[PDB]
Amino acid sequence: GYLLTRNPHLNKDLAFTLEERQQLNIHGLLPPSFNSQEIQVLRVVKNFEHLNSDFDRYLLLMDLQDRNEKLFYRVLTSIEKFMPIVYTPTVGLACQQYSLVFRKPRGLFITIHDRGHIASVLNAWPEDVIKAIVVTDGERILGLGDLGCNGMGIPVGKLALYTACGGMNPQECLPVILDVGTENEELLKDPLYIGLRQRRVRGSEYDDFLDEFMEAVSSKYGMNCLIQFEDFANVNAFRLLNKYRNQYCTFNDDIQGTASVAVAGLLAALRITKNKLSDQTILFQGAGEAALGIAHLIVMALEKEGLPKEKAIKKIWLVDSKGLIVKGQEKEKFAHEHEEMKNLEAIVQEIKPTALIGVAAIGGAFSEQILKDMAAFNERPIIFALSNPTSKAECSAEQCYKITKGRAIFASGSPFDPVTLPNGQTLYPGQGNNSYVFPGVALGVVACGLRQITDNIFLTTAEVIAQQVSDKHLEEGRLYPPLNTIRDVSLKIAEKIVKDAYQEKTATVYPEPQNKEAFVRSQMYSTDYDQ
Amino acid sequence: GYLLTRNPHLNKDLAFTLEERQQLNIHGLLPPSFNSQEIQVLRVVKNFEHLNSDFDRYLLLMDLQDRNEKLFYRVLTSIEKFMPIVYTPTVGLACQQYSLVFRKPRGLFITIHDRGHIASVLNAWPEDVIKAIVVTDGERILGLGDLGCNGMGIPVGKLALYTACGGMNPQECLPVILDVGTENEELLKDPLYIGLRQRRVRGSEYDDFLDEFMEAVSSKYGMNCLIQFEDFANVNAFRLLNKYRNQYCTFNDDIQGTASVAVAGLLAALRITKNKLSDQTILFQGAGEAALGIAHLIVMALEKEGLPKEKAIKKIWLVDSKGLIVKGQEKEKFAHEHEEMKNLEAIVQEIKPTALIGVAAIGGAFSEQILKDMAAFNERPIIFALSNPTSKAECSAEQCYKITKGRAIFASGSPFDPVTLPNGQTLYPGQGNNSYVFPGVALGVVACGLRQITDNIFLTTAEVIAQQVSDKHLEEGRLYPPLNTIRDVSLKIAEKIVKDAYQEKTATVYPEPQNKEAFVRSQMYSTDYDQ
Fold this sequence. Notes:
Chains A, B: Keywords: Acetylation, Cytoplasm, Metal-binding, NADP, Oxidoreductase, Phosphoprotein. 2 copies of one chain form a homodimer. Chain A contains 24 helices and 14 strands. The first copy, chain A, is of the alpha/beta class and 531 residues long. In chain A, the strands form 3 sheets. Chain A has a 7-stranded mixed β-sheet, with helices on both faces. In chain A, strands 1-3-2-4-5 form a 5-stranded parallel β-sheet, with helices on both faces.
C-alpha cells in the first residue's frame, strides 16, 4: 500500500485504477479522481508552463522523476521541448547550483577517500543489474569548467535521455560522479559545498583511482556493462578513452558522439551537393577533442569509399589557437607542408575548403568575410557551427543564410529558429545534437553484448542517421532527421549495430534472435504503467 | 539503507553521520559533505530567499516535509517568517491551485461514496496512533469560499503548526478532507479537478455521513482523539460543533480559537486601561461565527469576575449586515431594547463603546469618523480589527494610531508593521493569531486525556496568554506575547490545562504525573534527529 506510493518505479498517482486502490489498500491516500496518463501529462505540462524559469522547470521534472518515473519519461517522450530542460543547456545551470539546490540524491558519489574500497561503495546501490553507466569527475562541464561534485547533474540528465530517446531501462542505469577534489575557488569557499573540500588529486594517485573504478564496475556488473565518460578535461578524456576502450565496454560521448553526428551531417550534405566525400576539402576551426575525433572518423569514411589513409588525411586541415597546423602529437598527423598562418579569413582564402566546421568554442569566428568567401569558392558551401551554447557559435543561421544568399548548407550544435529567405522558402537548420547518437549506440551495444565499442560502429551510426534524412527534409535545409523522431532513429541505429554484430560474431548475447528489429524493441522501455 | 533514505521520519540527508552511513549501507548514496542541522537550515533558507514567490516557498517547504520531517520542523521553529508560508495566507493560494499543483498526497480523502465503509478508509492510513485530526469539507476556505477537495491544503498546513508551535508528534496527526461535492463552477468544469465532479450533498445524507465519520474516528483511535473542524460553512460549523462537543473530543478553531485570542487581547488591554472587564461596553462589527463566539466567552469572563449572566450580556452589542441587533436565535440573546439603526458611524455615537471589535470581513469599516469618535469617548479606546486578510481589515494600524493620536490600544488578525508616532515612540501592534491558542490547547487536552473541550478551557487559555504579555510589551503596544515565543506560550497553556484537569479529576491519563511541566515537555516533539 502506502509503500508502493513511495516507490517511484511503480507509483501511478491518480492513474491508480479504482480497483487497484482497493486491492492495494490505498483507497483514501488519494483524492477521488482517476486520471489516464494523458490527463496526468496535461497537468504536468500546465505546471511546466506557468513556471517562471527553465531552471524551475528542471526542478519540477526532476521532482517528478523522483516520484513517478513512468510519468516522468512519458512527459519527456511527449523531447524537443523537454530535452533542453532535463539536459544541456539547463542542466549546466543546475550543476552550478547543485549545492544550493541539493534535494533527493540520485546516483553514486565515489570519492578518492574510497580508493581500495570502491567495490563496497557500489554495494550501496539498490539496483543489481546495471547495463549503463555515465561518469564524470566534474572537471569540464560544458563551458562552465570545473564544478567538482556539483557535476552529478550531468550523468543524471544524460541517462534520462538514454531512457527517453533510446529506451534504456532507467532501473539499469547508474549515474556516477568521481570526486577527487575541485579547483573551483568559490566552491572550496562555500560552506554549502557538498564535495570534498580540497584541490584535485592529479597524477598516479588519480590514474589508479580510475583503474580501480573500471575494475570494480566491470566486476560487479560484468564486462558488458557500458561505461560512458563525460565532461572530463581534455587530456584525461583522451588518456582514459584510449587506455580503456579495448578492455572495457566504453566510450566518451564528447569526442566520439560528436564525431558521429558531425559526420552524419556531412554524409547528409553530400546528397545536396551530389558529389563524393573524396571531392571535399575540410577545414576545422578548432583542433581539440571534437575536431580530432571528427577528422579521424571522416578519414575512416574516406577509406571505406576506397582511398588509402595517406591520400585521405591530405583532404583535412585543422586550426588551433596558435594558428593553422602545418609541418613545423595527434595534431601532428594532419600537419601538412604549408606556410604557417594565423588569420582565419586568410586561411579560408588560401585553402578554399568545401566544408567548414567550427568546434572551437569561439563565437562569431565565421565572419561575413569568411561566409562571403565560402559562398564564392563553392556553389553550396557546407558550414557547421557546432560549438555550444548559441552565444559561442561560429555564426547564426540567419547570418549564414543571409550572407551566402541562401546557398549555404548549414547545421549547428545549438538549435536555431527556422529562417525565411527573400525567396519565400523557409529553411530549418538542423541541430548537431549528440543525442542522435548515444542513445541508439548504447541500446545496440548493450542489446547484443558488444564488449568494445569501435570506431566502426560510430561510422555506421553516422551512416544510419544520414540514411534517415528524407529528400523532403534536405530540401527544407535539414541535415538531420526531425528531433521529434529520435526514438525511431535510435531504434534504426540499434538495429544496424545488432544485425552487424551477429553477422560478424561480435555479439555475445546468445541465442541469436531470429528478428533483430523485434529483438531491439524487446529491450526498449515503455512509458506505459506495468499491470 | 536506501529505504531509510525514503522514509521522511528518519531520513537525515547530509546530517547522516559518516559512521551511520557505513553502518546503514548508504555511503555513496550521498555526497561526501557532512552537515549539522544548522548548515542544513542555512541551505533551505538560502533557497527560500532566492525564490520568486511565497507560493514557490510553500512548494519548497512542502517538498521538504515530504522528504525530511525533522528538518522541515527545524526550519519552521527557527515561525514568524514561515507560518505565513505554510499556513494562512499562502495556504489559500495553495488550495486554489491544489489541482494544478497536486504532487505527493498527504492526509486522508474520505468521500460520501464511502458512506457505510468509512472505517475501512481509515485503515489505509499507515500510522496507527493518531491523537489529533483536523478536518474540513472545503466549503468555506478563509475568504475564498468553496474550493471542494482542493481544501486539503488547509488541514495539512494547520497540523504543521500543531507540531511546530505545540510539539504534537506529526506521526500522530491526521489531516482529513471530507469530499461531498463542491458548488465551485470552475472546479466542476476543470478536467484537472481531483475531487468528486458533483454538487454538494446537503441535508440528512450529509449529516449521517458526518455522524459515521466521528463514530469511525473515535472507534479506531479512541474517544480521546482530538477532532478539530475547520473551514466549514457557518451553519454547519455551529450545527456540528454543538452536536458533537459533549460526545467527542472536539472544537472548531474558527469560532472557539478566535474567541480565545480575542478575549486574551481584551484581558491584556485591561492592564493598559487599568479597569475591570465589567466597566467595558463592547461593540462588535459582525454577528457571525467569530462575533458570537467571542461574546459568549466575554460573558463567561464577566461571570467569573462576579456578574450574573443577565447583567453581563447587557454590556455587549452586535452589528450584522442588516444593522444593529435590537429587541425586534443565538443573535436573539444579545437583542437589547433599542431603536434600530444601520449606519456604523451613528451606531458608535449612540452606544459610545469602550471596545470596538471588527470580525465582519468588511475592510475599512472603522473609518476616520469612527476612530475619531472612539478616541473622543475613551482616553484609550480598544480597537480590534480581526478580519482577514489585511485587505479586509476594519482599519490599518497606521490609520488607527494616527487618527487616535496614538491613544488607541490596537490589535489585528493579520500582521501590520510597527508604527512610529510623532512622539518618536514606536508601537508594535499585535496579531490576533489563532495559533496562540490551538496548539497549546491541543497539546494540553491530548496530554492528560480530556474527553470534551469546554468553554472554560478556552477562557483559561485566554487568561494564560494575557498573563504572558510583559509590561514592557504592553508599553510597546503589544497585547500578545511576541510571536517568536509561541512554543513557550503553548507550553504554558498546556501546563495550565493539565494542572487543572488533575485537580478537577477531568484528566483520564493516569497515573498522575508528579511534575506537570515536565510531563507536558515529555509530550512535545523535538526538532532533533533521533539517535
